[PDB]
Design a protein around this ligand. Sequence first.
Ligand SMILES: CC(C)(COP(=O)(O)OP(=O)(O)O)[C@@H](O)C(=O)NCCC(N)=O
Ligand SMILES: CC(C)(COP(=O)(O)OP(=O)(O)O)[C@@H](O)C(=O)NCCC(N)=O
Lengths: 445, 446, 456, 440
Amino acid sequence: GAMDELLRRAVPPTPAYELREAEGQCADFVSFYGGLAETAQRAELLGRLARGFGVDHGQVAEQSAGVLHLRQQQREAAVLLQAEDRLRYALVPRYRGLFHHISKLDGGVRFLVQLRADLLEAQALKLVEGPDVREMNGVLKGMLSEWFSSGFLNLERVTWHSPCEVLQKISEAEAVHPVKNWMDMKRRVGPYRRCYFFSHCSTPGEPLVVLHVALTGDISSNIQAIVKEHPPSETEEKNKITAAIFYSISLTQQGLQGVELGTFLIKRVVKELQREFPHLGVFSSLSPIPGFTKWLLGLLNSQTKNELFTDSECKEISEITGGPINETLKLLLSSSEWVQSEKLVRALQTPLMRLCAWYLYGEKHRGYALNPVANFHLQNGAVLWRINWMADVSLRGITGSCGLMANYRYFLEETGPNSTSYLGSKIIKASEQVLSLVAQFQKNS
Amino acid sequence: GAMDELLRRAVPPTPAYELREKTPAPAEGQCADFVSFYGGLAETAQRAELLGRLARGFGVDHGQVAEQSAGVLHLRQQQREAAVLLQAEDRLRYALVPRYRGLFHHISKLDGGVRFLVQLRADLLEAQALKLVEGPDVREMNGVLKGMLSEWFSSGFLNLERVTWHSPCEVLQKISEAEAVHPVKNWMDMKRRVGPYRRCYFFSHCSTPGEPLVVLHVALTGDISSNIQAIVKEHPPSETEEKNKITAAIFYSISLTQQGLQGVELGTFLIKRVVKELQREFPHLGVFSSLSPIPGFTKWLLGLLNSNELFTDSECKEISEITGGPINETLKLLLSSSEWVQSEKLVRALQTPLMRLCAWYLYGEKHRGYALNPVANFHLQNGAVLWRINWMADVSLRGITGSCGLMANYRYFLEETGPNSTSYLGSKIIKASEQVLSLVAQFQKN
Amino acid sequence: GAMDELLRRAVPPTPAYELREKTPAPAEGQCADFVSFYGGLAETAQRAELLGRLARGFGVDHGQVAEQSAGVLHLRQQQREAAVLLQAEDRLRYALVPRYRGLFHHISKLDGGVRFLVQLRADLLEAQALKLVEGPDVREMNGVLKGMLSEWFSSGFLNLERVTWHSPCEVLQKISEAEAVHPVKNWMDMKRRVGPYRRCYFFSHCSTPGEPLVVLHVALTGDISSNIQAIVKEHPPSETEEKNKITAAIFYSISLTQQGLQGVELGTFLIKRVVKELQREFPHLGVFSSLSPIPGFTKWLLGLLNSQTKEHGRNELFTDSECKEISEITGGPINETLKLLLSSSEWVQSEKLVRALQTPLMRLCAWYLYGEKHRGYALNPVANFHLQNGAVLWRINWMADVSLRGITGSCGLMANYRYFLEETGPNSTSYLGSKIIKASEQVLSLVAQFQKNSKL
Amino acid sequence: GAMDELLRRAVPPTPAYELREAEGQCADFVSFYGGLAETAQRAELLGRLARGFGVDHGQVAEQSAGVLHLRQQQREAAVLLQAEDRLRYALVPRYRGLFHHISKLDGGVRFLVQLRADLLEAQALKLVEGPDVREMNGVLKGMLSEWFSSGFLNLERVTWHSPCEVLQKISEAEAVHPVKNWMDMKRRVGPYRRCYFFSHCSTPGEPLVVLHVALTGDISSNIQAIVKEHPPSETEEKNKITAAIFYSISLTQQGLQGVELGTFLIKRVVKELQREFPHLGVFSSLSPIPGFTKWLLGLLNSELFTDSECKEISEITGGPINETLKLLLSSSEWVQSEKLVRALQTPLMRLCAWYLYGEKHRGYALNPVANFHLQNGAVLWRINWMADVSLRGITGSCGLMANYRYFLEETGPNSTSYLGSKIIKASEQVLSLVAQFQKN
Ligand SMILES: CC(C)(COP(=O)(O)OP(=O)(O)O)[C@@H](O)C(=O)NCCC(N)=O
Ligand SMILES: CC(C)(COP(=O)(O)OP(=O)(O)O)[C@@H](O)C(=O)NCCC(N)=O
């Protein structure tokens, strides 16, 4: 009814072609979109926009034919090149014109970053579907990747000398591990810790992406050991800083996904630590495995009459849970109770670790590694270096991935080709420990 | 010879399509090599040839395009799902993006890249203006670079810095040097231009703050100014600005500092941003206009004075009675001399027709239907009204020569700037004052 | 004991007189040695003895004084030229400046000197308040140090820094720690105190900017506030300060950070400077007052509730009708009754009792501020401070502070010291020179009520 | 009529004694003093204030007697000490009360710094005389030395990145050598040059005292060599910076004289240069000799010249010695007559050596610039012939510039010896010229 009437007067028409080289129309769109409360409403609006205001498939098809018409006679660089530009133009979707103008308005880029986050949330919630939303997504992503391309991001460091607004924002959008009080946030940014972020050169002190670093002795195999420490406060001694551990890495603005913000922050933070500590050569993460429990629980099925446990392993389990294997585990593995029963913990060490190794290494989504965190560190050329048993005993941790945390190591002089091998050939570089667990798993499935 | 070699190992290769949203690792290295090399090239002619080599060899892949075009066509003959058609359309759109965009994009991320890219554009515009590189390929490459530079130098990427006497000397020296409309006389003068009743601003890129890109000088006044000398040659009583006696704001000088950014931006945001900026200090300030020169006027007159009507018989009889000679040999001489101004008798008689002639030159004379005069175009683009033509407005040697001492008033009406811009850009329409329209109507006689 | 030694090689020697306006070279070294040593002394009693040693041995040269006095006298017997008389007078004036002034002056120039000297004063005041150092010499030395410190902490030597949420955490932690009137509850609270409708300022020495000396908290309001809880326990709608709804400015906390600077300054500039500062942002803002506590009140009441008992149940502080009432509420005598429940902070629970205790307590408090004196200068320190600055003892507030701290210290009473921008100068003179207090009709009324029925 | 009427209602009376521990009266004084245009008017006002509002010589005499009355019976530390404080009080002049209060008002200390400069100028111009102005001077000086002691001054460095307001102020109150254009001021603060100043910690970027430094190869013997150079601009190479030469040292605020602002600027500037250039151990000034011409001319009234020297002079000037030289030595013409220059080399240099070394004002060294560097423990190290050819230079000190050297490990005792014992440390070159002069 309404919704459509706005779209038609807000989205400018596609200029003929010539006159391609609507200011007071944009404010009409932003004003309206802001006026909608429910996400469901923003979904229908973005959905209808994406549908009715894409390319003109007719003209695209016409200009395409016009290019082939010209390659049969091969005439001048000049006239062939215009036939190509006419096609390039027909391919420019109609909503791109709307975004392009909005961006050149006041609260412009801020609004578009926001809008995309609204679209990303509606996509994952299955409120918007089809291929017209997937296109609009990429268009916004492309536009955002040019305004937020590394060269325009300042690397800022967080300390206790930083503004309170910054510490609050860093703890608030902290999308990994909660902080318990101010008493703690002082420790988190204090000695033996590094908290770096990225801000746009336009808007400083406004964090886009946030990274947390633990300056340590060896590669950490536990998160509680970092979060719940009382780092001496005997000012950093360089002698005992041998490993840089990445423990929290989160986006503050969901609108900026797939813009490689994360990747560059790690890259830039390394060159920083390298400058400060010239005798530091061990760079690794202590990352979670989100979706592992959901994968395992899901797999505890069924009519694929899928064996994930040896004879010896199954008998031991059931003589600790009072019933069959599949129904008992399905119940308690989603309720975090199983941890206080130490017989069931020691029992579940070897198989879980082995299935976990497989979950990261063997399981694929388009051949890239289902686990999005795994894809992230591997894209960057990291090595799936070590799997750590009961490394995260916290509620989200236990029910999220049965307490399992993974170590993704960064070997500086081999990140570049590891990125290529991973992206080009779909290869995962894994340590002898991980390959052994994958080897164990190969004995049964 | 070797120029060719660098290009083939420096211009990053077009990635697969699936790996299109992900930067490959060697991109950082490959770019620095290009920057290193282009930097190493001293004489421009080499830079010009290399740019030619780039536009030719590293544009759109013509084979992949024709293929994907048949792709989209072969699918529309068998009405396939939108799911499929969009996919085939997208690969064609990606296949249409030229290879040099990757080079430019990957150079932007570098330690001094955006600066470098600006300097590169400057060379490409020079290489063209010196017929050193002709061709649609260089033309294609120019437009792609401009577009990229347009997003990196858009309002929201620029700071509005103010110059005062509290500003460092380094800064004042930069503004004096980059001064393009009316050169600064002495230091005692520079102090006046940033003092009481005068505001001086510049826009800097957020990434390189302090390095100016555009200098705007503003005169705070009681009316719409009509004489340039009346601004620069005024020493006020130094008494801190009487806020009450400020009716309007006049823009008397606008300088683009970097030739690399020629008409990438729009212009409006240079103005309307300085306006809000001023308004904060002077809430009740509501009148805004420029006091612009008319470069290209005197030349356009002399160019035409080769035959034509232009003057009345009564004016023809008069000029000659003042001078002593014919008219079409007379005017020709004293106009292309800057000496005619000395005879007040002559200054007065020349007034009516020159004003009339000028009024046509701005409003009637077009270049692809977009106003022949560059200054006019600029203000017209932004939505300014061709408000008033001024007689003996600039009596400096530079003014008399370039535009027979005439200066136009481009008046910005905060409220009507949007529609006025549309009218001018879309429909090629000029909003002009009654004072201007009157003179055009007078010209329309002969 | 080796204390003596350091003093004789650390306190710079009095220069000639001709070389009086020129610093000698070893002065820098000699001072650093004194700072080094005094710093090295851990237990206070040592610092107290060393200060005693200094005041005694390094004051005025009593020999040189008596000599120059005879000098000025021996010349006035023979009416010599002004040229000569002034010269002899000046040497006597110089001969009267004690030796420890040179020490203090030469320490001031040092890398951390003024800070050090403040801390030194704090010790000298402590050493006196603990009868650790008695005598006119320490009294002389105290007065000389105060005077020196008065010129270094004089408005024009202080910065006015503002605390907001953009300020560093280091700064917010310093303000939380140095909080002296109403302790800050939690961090979510600290954000509120420097947020919309609240201003937080401090004065720092120009030389050490960022190191605060005095924290002023301000509540931007629609009227003159009367309840402390109504300030701190308010969460506004966060909507950027509606400029229009701000009638007045209230000072709810004032904290002196360094005990070394106790009453060297005046106070006037602390207020009036924050005032001009505020006024710039809110031109049409014209009402100013503090919402101060009354520390030392409840104790003063209980103190009298002992020595000021009387015959057949009644006493000097209450009426018979009030005496009959309180006891009817409680169940017991009165002068044993009040004594107990007042020194408990539990009386507040009975609304019956809260109401009856009102009229007399307000009356008693009004005397305590306006009638009760200490060397004729108002017994209450907070009162003195605001009175000094030229503030009017504007209004006494009932159940103003219902916190456990408030009820204990001053039975939930809080006074309003109102600053009238215009009359601050005369009001200050009146208070300082003539020991006069400008008070509201609301206050004067209550004093007159106290006078009608209390010989004390 | 007025003047006196104001003073009486503005200057508060001296409180009895007890009540010693008038805010709206001060503004009445500052408002009025500002209202006066002529310096001549400010002189009469400061003169009358100084006269009628000093000490009460009566009470001073009375309290003095009361101290001697107490030492005949020697009673308690307590009661003797009060008799001393009562005397200390009577000695406090009445105008000190006015200044003390003014200082605690807004544009306070700024106003007092200004007022003293008005008094210093009126004193030197002989508008105000007597001993009551000399006392008021010292009072103001004492009050100023406590608000301006080293501890409260920030050391600021001037470069081309500095505000225009700063460069202008540095060139404007440049009280030694004029700068010709902006083109020059860039060079003056540019490479191989150091321009440092002092600002109060209250008012930053507001210069009180200004010092100029030339980063050089050896101790400079000419000012034109520094002022009129074109320092390479090939950014500083540390290898060729062996000597730090102080060439301009001037006060911007005349109100702050004798407050040792100068000394502490050098002391602090040294510790800075020492930090930046650890291989730098040669510190010296290239200072003028103001008042030398005036001394010499004065002395030609009416033998400072040997037989051989007099005959040579007169056979170059057309008349007697005293009247001829008196005329041309004050007109800077004598420089373009090279016969008269070479003639006047040896005697001038010798008389000049004496002027700095031998001539004394209270035994300290008449030349105030000489007293300055010597107070600091500097050595009168070298006299330089025709080192300042500029107009002020020639007519000021017949082109003579002197080198005051700073030997770092012996400045401390040289300061003591100079101040305590009135000794001047001079190099063998200077002692030789003094020796030459001793034959006269
Ligand atoms: C880094 C995160 C926040 C997203 O980064 P993003 O900027 O979207 O990466 P990219 O896809 O843009 O390259 C996320 O995907 C992730 O990997 N989070 C946890 C990683 C960890 N804790 O080690
Ligand atoms: C430095 C001058 C300007 C006065 O300084 P001042 O602040 O009075 O020194 P002080 O007596 O306060 O220590 C002056 O006495 C002087 O020495 N001038 C020239 C010195 C030089 N050019 O090297």
